[PDB]
Nucleic acid binder design. Sequence first.
RNA 1: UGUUUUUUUCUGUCUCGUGCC
Lengths: 126, 171, 732
Amino acid sequence: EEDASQLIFPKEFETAETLLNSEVHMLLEHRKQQNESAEDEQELSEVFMKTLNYTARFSRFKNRETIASVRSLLLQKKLHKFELACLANLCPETAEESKALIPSLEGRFEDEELQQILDDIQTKRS
Amino acid sequence: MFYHISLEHEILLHPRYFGPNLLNTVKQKLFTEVEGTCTGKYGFVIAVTTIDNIGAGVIQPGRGFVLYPVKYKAIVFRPFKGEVVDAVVTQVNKVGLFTEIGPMSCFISRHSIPSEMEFDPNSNPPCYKTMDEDIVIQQDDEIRLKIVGTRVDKNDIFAIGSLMDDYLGLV
Amino acid sequence: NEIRATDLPERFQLRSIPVKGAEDDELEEEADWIYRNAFATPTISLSRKGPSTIQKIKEALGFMRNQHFEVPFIAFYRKEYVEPELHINDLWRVWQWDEKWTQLRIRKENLTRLFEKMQAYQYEQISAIRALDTTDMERLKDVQSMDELKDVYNHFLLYYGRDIPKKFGLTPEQFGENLRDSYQRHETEQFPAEPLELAKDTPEAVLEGARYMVALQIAREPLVRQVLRQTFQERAKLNITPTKKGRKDVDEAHYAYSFKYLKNKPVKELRDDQFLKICLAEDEGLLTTDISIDLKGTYFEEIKQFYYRDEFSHQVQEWNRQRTMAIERALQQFLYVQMAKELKNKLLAEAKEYVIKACSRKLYNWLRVAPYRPDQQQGKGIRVLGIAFSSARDHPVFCALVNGEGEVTDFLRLPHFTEEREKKAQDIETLKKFLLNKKPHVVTVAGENRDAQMLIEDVKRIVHELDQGQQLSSIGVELVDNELAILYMNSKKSEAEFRDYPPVLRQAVSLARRIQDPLIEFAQVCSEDILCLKFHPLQEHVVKEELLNALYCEFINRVNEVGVDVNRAIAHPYSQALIQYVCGLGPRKGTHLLKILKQNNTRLESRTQLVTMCHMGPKVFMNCAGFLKIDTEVLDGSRVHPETYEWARKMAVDALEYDESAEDANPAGALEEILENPERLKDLDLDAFAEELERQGYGDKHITLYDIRAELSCRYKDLRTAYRSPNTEEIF
RNA sequence: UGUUUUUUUCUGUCUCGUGCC
């Protein structure tokens, strides 16, 4: 029954806080920077390294202010939290591609209304 | 898909750890307990960012071990069905494709792949192309997919991908 | 059915997998590809010369495509068409070159078709920085350039767009030409405009918009890849230096840890010396590796001047600055990383080649069949007394006395040993009783330490002093290293021969077999069995597929040179299953022939047994004519095939000066007298034989005349080495 | 130029009578 396409999740996960690829990338980078110092400390595991090299290959923007701006310009809408992560991470070119990938956008909003958002997201990319 | 939620956990601390570094020892024990593990309820945990507070240690009767129900603010990665993410292809085999969604590796079979994407066993690098050889997909490429299923192999998550929907390839 | 009852032999079909045969026009292309890709970095096949080697490779490929020729079949049967014994790796190298040429041709054709389709699509779209379908022809023609061609094709796909519905700086071609020639023929955009004006005509408001496009164009350009390709791969002084953690972790075990400050190692040390490449790969795996040419700082400076404007007055200065920025962006994108990746790939290929060469050398050294028969040739063969003791410390030591016909006659144990702290007579008495029990022909003792060597020496002394070798004479116990017998004892053949026996008996049987017929043991093992023996530590780093292929080719060549006994693989299990490494007789074909022989009860009547009984096809018989041998026609058990039987008979008659009347079996003087010993060699002239072959036969017999004479004079010649007695260092 | 050993918590039934603090 758990299918994110139809916007259903368990009660515990419904009150969660969405994270973007750049956000988690910078959080892990800062954690690595803190952990590398302060000698006599248990070094990072393979999980941390794999997550780092996985999120580093999808960092659409390095500046934290870019993350703040893209989340601020998106939260003003009426979309759910789940729609804040996938759409801001994939960064589709045209509204048709976004509507095809995410079935929730089908009929939820107009075509130009989503195309302008996608163009803004593309321009915000570094 | 990564999230930032508030979790709770309790750890017993042996009385040998009492002293001026009690809180530091509790934090160190917490760090090396709830990083990298996985559960069927919240999913796979990446790491811990910060700790909210330290509970009141209730010393057990007849035992020097004392438990601290600490509540930590850590991140978690619990992908669901139907989500679309961008991963990287690790290996190409005739049985199927191999990818790596962060702390996960999914897998797509040839049946999911359309018939246009044939095999290239003659070439040294295992790769799939079309008749015109215009589009090329190989390893170390940011190829998208759709999570159509989930599985937890005793705190080892392993989902399954799919390549039926349009606009799934090079961006 | 396709493997056993196929028109072409199994080896020929397996060799030309990607390229199913060679056409008349494709033979020249395959030969040219093989010659070009024969020895680029190291010197290989420089023996055969350049043009002579290319012609020989082309002739071998043509023979393989037409007559279903194989590696040994074309190396021996086609000694004239190929290098006449130039090197052992003649047929296999020719087959590999032909396969590579066919694959390159197929890739070029596919690239040309894709380029034509893209050009047609662009013409249809834009015909109703442009998109021209002119690079498709260049990509199709670029057959030799595999990596460069692929890079150029990928760059074209990324530049034109790759979409399938159903003025900024110098041009890319001009910049590539200026970089390749080393002189900047074309400068940057010599216009009064600057990056301020160019960043307003995209919607970014930043001056780096054109830099990304310039970098993408430069990286996705075949000319740039060609210019950079071989610049650092040809020479790269890789400086080996351990890091902070590598110095202690390696402990001078790898290439990146042996020399603390031993740097400037050029391409020769890594390519030619596969050990250095293996060490660098091992060190670069977990801890760290020191692989840096350190020659760019001066290779990247010269390119900076090219493609940039010379004047500096705003327009000229702006153009020069923009060109420099674009060049820097392109270098950062696919300039340093591409060169580093190419160098790493070249180093890995060199290490793999070195590992394969070491494995092939080890296989050639250890695969030559050099048994120790009676007199170093009563009864056929000698009775090998395989003595494989466990400890020689009051424990039962296996001692089997196997015969010389690939079978174990008997065995026994010797629990008594010098057990007892002070017992110098029990071991001697046990050895004397064991020697008197049977009548062996030779002693094959093993060894593990000083105690084992002392026990073997004591046993040999007891045998020689009391004449325990044969009960009527002293027999010298030949030392045998416990290397092949131990592995063969616990093999499938050892288990099948004896199931309810201790491992000592199996080890003794394996040691006896290894000193009586190494070829039989090598052919009767899975090749799994061959991979058990390590050829060198550097082979592990390289791909094991190349080593396995080299070992299989060496085994096939050895089997073809030594021949195969048809009667030996009919009833004797020890000498059975030896039709898997034959020239043209693959494993499936050999298994089918063995099954047919077992069912129908057909023996090795002659060389035409598989052609007359309907067991083997005409192509299989022709390709495997020089490898199948029988016990009894006269020229059946030799390299003389049916085609050369008449020529061999005529040559024997001429040498013996006997009458000529249908000489196949009836006249025995020219056959039997010639086989017994050399009767007359001056009678048979090389020029006359060659003229006779050319006039009647459709082939020159200048090179095959010696082989035919040797086959007529000596049948079933063995290509294995002689018996190698253990040395001091070798024994240790 | 040599020196012979390694296995371990078992476990018992239901009923009646007598004596003692």
